[PDB]
Every structure is written in structure tokens, then in C-alpha cells.
Amino acid sequence: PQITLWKRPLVTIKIGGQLKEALLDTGADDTIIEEMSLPGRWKPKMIGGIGGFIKVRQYDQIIIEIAGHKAIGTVLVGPTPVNIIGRNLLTQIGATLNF
Amino acid sequence: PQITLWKRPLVTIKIGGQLKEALLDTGADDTIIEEMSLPGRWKPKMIGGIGGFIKVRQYDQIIIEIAGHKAIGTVLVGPTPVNIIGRNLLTQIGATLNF
Ligand SMILES: CC(C)CN(C[C@@H](O)[C@H](Cc1ccccc1)NC(=O)O[C@H]1CO[C@H]2OCC[C@H]21)S(=O)(=O)c1ccc(N)cc1
Ligand SMILES: CC(C)CN(C[C@@H](O)[C@H](Cc1ccccc1)NC(=O)O[C@H]1CO[C@H]2OCC[C@H]21)S(=O)(=O)c1ccc(N)cc1
Ligand SMILES: [Cl-]
Ligand SMILES: [Cl-]
Ligand SMILES: [Cl-]
Numbered sequence: 317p318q319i320t321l322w323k324r325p326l327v328t329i330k331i332g333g334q335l336k337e338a339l340l341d342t343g344a345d346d347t348i349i350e351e352m353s354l355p356g357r358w359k360p361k362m363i364g365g366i367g368g369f370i371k372v373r374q375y376d377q378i379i380i381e382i383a384g385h386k387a388i389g390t391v392l393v394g395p396t397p398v399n400i401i402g403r404n405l406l407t408q409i410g411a412t413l414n415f
Numbered sequence: 416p417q418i419t420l421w422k423r424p425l426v427t428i429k430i431g432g433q434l435k436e437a438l439l440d441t442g443a444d445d446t447i448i449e450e451m452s453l454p455g456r457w458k459p460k461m462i463g464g465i466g467g468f469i470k471v472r473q474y475d476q477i478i479i480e481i482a483g484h485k486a487i488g489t490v491l492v493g494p495t496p497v498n499i500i501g502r503n504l505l506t507q508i509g510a511t512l513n514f
Pocket of ligand 1: 339341342343344345346347348363364365366398400402440441442443444445446447462463464465496497499501
């Protein structure tokens with residue numbers, strides 16, 4: 317698609333048997349969601365945002381469908397106020413920002 | 416241009432006759448610039464993301480040039496670690512996400 321930005325660019329994502337939605341976020345280096353069903357052990361990671369820094373749960377090799385496109389990569393679980401697809405996965409689906 | 420997302424999508428901006436650089440951020444609802452002087456009256460606001468909220472000054476109807484393209488709209492000023500062009504100004508230059 318060619319997505320305008322008058323509203324948040326939310327898309328359907330799928331992980332395992334869970335359908336969720338997430339914000340395509342060109343300003344995010346990494347993907348973060350609030351919850352993933354029964355995802356096993358993580359590795360701790362720190363990341364920054366505008367308000368300070370948060371502890372997150374790093375999961376590697378996650379198979380995730382994003383707007384109908386398959387990606388496989390790292391998904392963080394943490395206290396993000398909105399689920400975000402960051403550049404680590406945007407590049408896998410071939411997303412570009414155009415003007 | 417067509418901007419791939421293997422690195423942060425930073426572009427040149429001009430605001431207040433000053434050349435700066437900012438992140439094109441589809442995850443940001445509104446634009447936030449590091450501390451600088453802007454004309455007109457401002458209003459106090461707060462904005463939120465990862466790690467919580469920050470206090471900002473809201474300036475309305477500010478001219479800006481984003482990668483050579485003029486936009487006019489609301490600019491927040493405050494303690495962001497990176498200058499961010501959010502959707503309120505990305506829409507003014509016709510930016511889209513394409514995949
Ligand atoms: C978290 C989003 C819903 C909102 N944010 C925009 C977002 O793109 C920020 C924009 C951003 C970018 C750098 C530093 C701070 C904020 N990225 C971000 O927090 O990404 C984090 C996950 O990947 C990591 O890479 C960048 C920081 C980490 S935000 O900066 O908090 C923000 C919120 C509201 C407005 N109006 C403007 C900006
Ligand atoms: C972007 C900032 C300028 C926003 N300001 C937040 C304020 O707390 C700043 C935040 C702040 C902190 C340090 C440096 C700059 C701004 N403090 C400030 O201006 O302190 C002044 C008093 O001491 C002086 O030395 C520091 C600046 C001067 S603020 O305009 O007063 C304001 C207040 C409340 C809200 N919600 C929104 C805005
Ligand atoms: Cl709509
Ligand atoms: Cl979708
Ligand atoms: Cl589990």
C-alpha cells in the first residue's frame with residue numbers, strides 16, 4: 317500500500333495465533349509490543365524513549381506477519397504505550413518513506 | 416525521495432532561519448524540536464511515549480522547511496533527545512509509507 321499519515325499508521329500483525337495491531341514507527345529503531353502469548357524466556361534489554369529508559373524483554377527469531385507480509389526477527393515486550401513496528405522489521409517488509 | 420530504513424530517516428530542516436536535522440517519525444503524532452527560540456505566544460503542554468511524559472511549549476503556525484519542502488503548523492519545543500518531525504507536518508509534505 318501507499319499509506320498517508322493523517323491518522324496513525326496502524327496495521328494488522330499476527331504472532332502465533334494472536335492477531336494484534338501495531339503502529340508503523342519510522343522513528344523506532346526496534347519493535348516493541350505490550351504482550352505476546354506464552355513466549356518463553358527472554359533476555360533483558362534497555363531502551364530509551366522520550367521520557368527516559370525502560371527495561372524490556374528481548375525475544376529473537378519471532379515469526380510475525382505485518383500487514384500481510386512475513387518477517388522474522390527480534391521483538392521486544394515492554395511497557396510501550398502503543399505497539400510499535402520499528403525499523404528492524406520495516407526493512408524486512410520493504411517499507412520506505414516517500415515524498 | 417524514497418528513503419529506506421536501514422538507518423534512521425534523518426533529514427535537513429530549516430526552522431527559525433537555522434539549519435538543523437530531524438527524524439522523520441511516523442510514530443510521532445506531532446513535531447518536537449529541541450530548545451530554541453520561536454516567535455509568537457506558546458502554550459504549555461505534555462507529551463508521552465516510552466518512559467513517560469515530558470513538558471513542552473506549543474507554538475502554532477510555525478514555518479519550517481523539511482528536506483526542502485515548506486510546511487506550516489504546530490511545533491512543540493522541549494527536551495527530546497532528537498528533533499522529530501511528526502505526522503502533523505509529514506502530512507503537509509505528502510509523505511507516505513510504501514510497501
Ligand atoms: C513511542 C511512540 C508511540 C511515540 N514516540 C515516537 C517514536 O518514534 C520515538 C522517537 C524517538 C527516537 C529517539 C529517541 C527518542 C524518541 N521512538 C522510540 O521511542 O523508539 C524507541 C524504540 O526503538 C528505539 O529507537 C529509538 C528510541 C527507542 S515519542 O518520541 O514518544 C513522541 C510522542 C508524541 C509526540 N507528539 C512526538 C513524539
Ligand atoms: C521546554 C521547556 C522550556 C518547558 N518548560 C518546562 C520547565 O520545567 C523548564 C525545563 C528546563 C530545564 C532546564 C533547562 C531548560 C528547560 N524549566 C525552566 O525553564 O527552568 C527555568 C528556571 O531555571 C532556569 O534554568 C533552567 C531554565 C530556566 S515550561 O515552558 O515552563 C512549561 C511548564 C509546564 C508545561 N506543562 C509545559 C511547559
Ligand atoms: Cl481515514
Ligand atoms: Cl493492515
Ligand atoms: Cl511462557
